[PDB]
Design a protein around this nucleic acid. Structure first.
Lengths: 218, 164, 206
RNA sequence: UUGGGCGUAAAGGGCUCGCAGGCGGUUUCUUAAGUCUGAUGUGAAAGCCCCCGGCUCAACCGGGGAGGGUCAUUGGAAACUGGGGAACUUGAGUGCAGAAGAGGAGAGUGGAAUUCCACGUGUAGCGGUGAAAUGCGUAGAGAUGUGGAGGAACACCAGUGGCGAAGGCGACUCUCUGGUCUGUAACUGACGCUGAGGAGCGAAAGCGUGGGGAGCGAACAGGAUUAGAUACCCUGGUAGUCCACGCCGUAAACGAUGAGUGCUAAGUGUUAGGGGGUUUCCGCCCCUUAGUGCUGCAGCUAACGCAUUAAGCACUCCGCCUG
RNA sequence: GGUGGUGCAUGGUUGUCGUCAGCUCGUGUCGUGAGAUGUUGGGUUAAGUCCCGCAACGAGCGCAACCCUUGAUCUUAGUUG
């Protein structure tokens, strides 16, 4: 769609006053005009992501909202670039070195359990190892094959993901994300003012981004 | 913005401060060192590094300074105009001077400005004598500086009438 | 209250005595002459450097094996000198002796050789900081798993002594499976007395 | 001043009313005291500064300039500060209709208690502390049921509620009396702010005179604890605590933040209102002033933290600080 | 030659808190700085033992185990038993 699927608004009326100060008589929420002003900024983000794909950069999608992780997961896989699905552990980008050198251990362990030694302690090694595998990989997710810093970032809730946007600032990574009415548009370079609670809308628009970059590829 | 490391940068260790922590087993000492790093063309910025050994603490500090750098306008090898640095009770005055005076500043301030490469400048330190706060105030001022050309374009005017 | 000696603890379980002979009713004098020949050869080979020397008994004929690559250089030019010195061991022991020279490849991970290196660097007026910090990384890139080295005494600040140690790696001393080789050496300086303690984690044993 | 500060580092007067003084809403004519600018007359010489000349550079010595007035006369300009004249209404007041209140002074009134007294019943202890003891009781206590006598304070309502400039102000009624907010637009048309000295208020203790004295209770006595205990604890208890009129003029008199004015994100309670949308039912919501709290941007902050009730951004006036 | 002084000139040794469960660093973040985080919060055990969250992610020395010895038994060996 480009008509309003579920972009109507937030559940409550306690919010950030950033860009809400001169709108005319609309509704309970005075902010109907977002239904129209959203489309052009979605277009701008579409062009931005098209340029990113054209120059070949790799976007990643980060999300811990209890009703978004699976969506960003499936869309990330068949879009073909990275994503976060679980606890956004702190300082990944600013400590890539640590993250690469620790996921390297995971890769060595896949080697050990696929071709390397499998049987030294017929109970102990397997029971601790396999648990360690699932432990770290569940938290990490699709951040395994980085070997480079992302060219841009896409967030789903900059309020919950304070550490994500905060880490993005110091590295000056160009940043995109959907922006609930209780978010802070000031620091993000492109704003997609939709409601983070809309379980339908979040996947409708992230898919609209995934196919955007996929078509930009060829 | 961040200035990459495609440059030749010198480091001037302004001070290493003895630092201690109190624990059950007496006292625990470390070494905190701040250093201002930057080329002479106009790139500057300080850093800090704490550790138990002076040389590798300095290594930490220089890495931090390299990671955090800043540019400055350089009109005629001198600042364009007046400015007061206003960081946390650190008061520093800067004035452009004629093309033969030289650098006239305090110790830490002189290190920062000379590393920046400003040839002719005078200054004054009015706040606390604390070196790190001197650095923070003066760099805040140096950031606050404004070239003439961007001022002209902001005003929608041109340099000839702005100087006229 | 300080630690037990690690090789002192590991002898006989993961380490051999470096005196592999049985005696009975002759234990005391066999042991005594073992210390005597150890002292003699260590004193007169200190310049060439040697780490550890094992002694072996057969039909009342002592026989020796001596370590380190430098006595390798003592093989060629000192080949006459080897016979010349072992004549002295014959004279001391009464009954004639046999010797062997074994080359320690990669001397950077022998505890006693490292300790002697540190002692010499200290006694020829080099700073403990440079000496120790350089030697640790030398051994590490020589391929040890972990090193801890320590010096003590009037460390330049002659009016009062103190202790200092550097280390980088993994070094379990409490585990009785590791191969923590240990040594210590004494360095005499003008401004006092300097002692050195160095040990290295080579690897476990299985 | 150029060139600092006053919440916790030194520093906001205890509070208020106000003489002098310092400051001054918008428009419009006029006057040129302030103001800005020419002309003239001086601001000696020698010095500092500039440019030249000379002692074999100059030290120095010359020659010529320039500067040096909160300066006198005179001319020119009128934007701003003053002066005068004519407007205007937002500031400031008056009138009109409501609303609230422990606001103040005076008179009277009432309820539960504590104590004392007399009376009935009433036996053996009551009271008290970490244990105890001093005390009160067979001259009949305490307890318990009556009736009086008195003096002090007004339980729940009562709420980071309300009022007051501050101290402070809570039972009820009445007499007198102060200030505030809301809506108006009918009136005057700048009548305003601040305020050294000055004047008045100014808790509690304290003092003077005359009453009053239930309880509490400095002092003081007795009993405990302690090595000692001039105290902490217990039993008493004088002065005071209360009333009328004077006096003192202090408090951590604190929000440790002077008064006035304007501007600068929000959210959220609560007090007294006003308007509107569904009903002129209730109660649902939206605006809206004035208070009175709580979180929280920018901003400030040395940190705490303050943040439309600024400790932010600014202007006037006063007070205060300089180890 | 000093069993003569100086353990407040030292090495090298040893006791003690204490076999207590703590003590630290790499990199990164927040603070301006002393600094903090990790090392806290839920339970868990003997434990900084483990798991769960958490601007932290890891690592090291400690704890555990790897060692000795006593507890049941299989194979080999039967002399001086």
């Amino acid at each position: 769609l480009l008509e309003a699927g579920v972009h109507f608004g937030h559940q409550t009326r306690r919010w950030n006053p950033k860009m809400k100060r001169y709108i005319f008589t609309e509704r309970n929420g005075i902010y109907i005009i977002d239904l129209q002003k959203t489309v052009k900024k979605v277009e701008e983000a579409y062009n931005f992501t098209k340029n990113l794909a054209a120059e070949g950069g790799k976007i990643l999608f980060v999300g811990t909202k209890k009703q978004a992780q699976d969506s960003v997961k499936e869309e990330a896989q068949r879009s073909g670039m990275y994503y976060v699905n679980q606890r956004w552990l702190g300082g990944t980008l600013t400590n890539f070195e640590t993250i690469q050198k620790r996921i390297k251990r995971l890769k060595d362990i896949e080697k050990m359990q696929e071709n390397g030694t499998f049987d030294v302690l017929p109970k102990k090694e397997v029971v601790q190892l396999k648990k360690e595998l699932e432990r770290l990989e569940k938290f990490l997710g699709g951040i395994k094959d980085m070997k480079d810093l992302p060219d841009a970032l896409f967030i789903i809730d900059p309020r919950k993901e304070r550490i994500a946007v905060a880490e993005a600032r110091k590295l000056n990574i160009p940043i995109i994300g959907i922006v609930d009415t209780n978010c802070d548009p000031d620091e993000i370079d492109v704003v997609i003012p939709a409601n983070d609670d809309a379980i339908r809308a979040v996947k409708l628009l992230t898919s609209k981004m995934a196919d955007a970059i996929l078509e930009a590829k060829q | 913005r961040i200035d990459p490391s495609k440059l030749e940068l010198e480091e001037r260790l302004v001070t290493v401060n003895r630092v201690a922590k109190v624990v059950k087993g007496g006292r625990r000492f470390r070494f905190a060192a701040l250093v201002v790093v930057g080329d002479k063309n106009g790139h500057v910025g300080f850093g800090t590094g704490k550790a138990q050994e002076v040389p590798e603490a300095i290594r930490k500090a220089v890495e931090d300074a390299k990671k955090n750098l800043i540019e400055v306008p350089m009109v005629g090898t001198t600042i364009p105009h007046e400015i007061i640095g206003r960081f946390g009770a650190g008061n520093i005055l800067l004035k452009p001077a004629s093309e033969g005076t030289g650098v006239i500043a305090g110790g830490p301030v002189r290190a920062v400005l000379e590393l920046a490469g400003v040839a002719d400048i005078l200054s004054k330190s009015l706040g606390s004598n604390t070196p790190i706060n001197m650095i923070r105030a003066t760099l805040q001022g140096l950031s606050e500086l404004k070239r003439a050309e961007d001022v002209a374009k902001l005003r929608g005017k041109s340099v000839e009438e702005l100087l006229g | 209250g300080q630690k037990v000696n690690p090789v002192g603890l590991r002898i006989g379980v993961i380490r051999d005595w470096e005196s592999k002979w049985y005696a009975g009713k002759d234990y005391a004098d066999f042991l005594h002459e073992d210390l005597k020949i150890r002292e003699y050869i260590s004193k007169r080979l200190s310049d060439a450097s040697v780490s550890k020397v094992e002694i072996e008994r057969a039909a009342n004929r002592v026989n020796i094996t001596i370590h380190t690559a430098k006595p390798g250089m003592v093989i060629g030019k000192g080949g006459s000198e080897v016979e010349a010195l072992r004549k002295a061991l014959n004279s001391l022991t009464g009954k004639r002796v046999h010797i062997n020279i074994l080359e320690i490849k990669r001397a950077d991970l022998d505890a006693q050789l490292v300790a002697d290196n540190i002692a010499r660097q200290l006694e020829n007026r080099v700073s403990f900081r440079r000496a120790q910090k350089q030697q640790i990384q030398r051994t590490m890139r020589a391929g040890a798993q972990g090193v801890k080295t320590m010096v003590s005494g009037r460390l330049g600040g002659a009016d009062i002594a103190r202790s200092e140690y550097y280390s980088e790696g993994t070094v379990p001393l409490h585990t009785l499976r590791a191969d923590i080789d240990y040594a210590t050496s004494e360095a005499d300086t003008t401004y006092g007395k300097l002692g050195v303690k160095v040990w290295i984690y080579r690897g476990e044993v299985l």
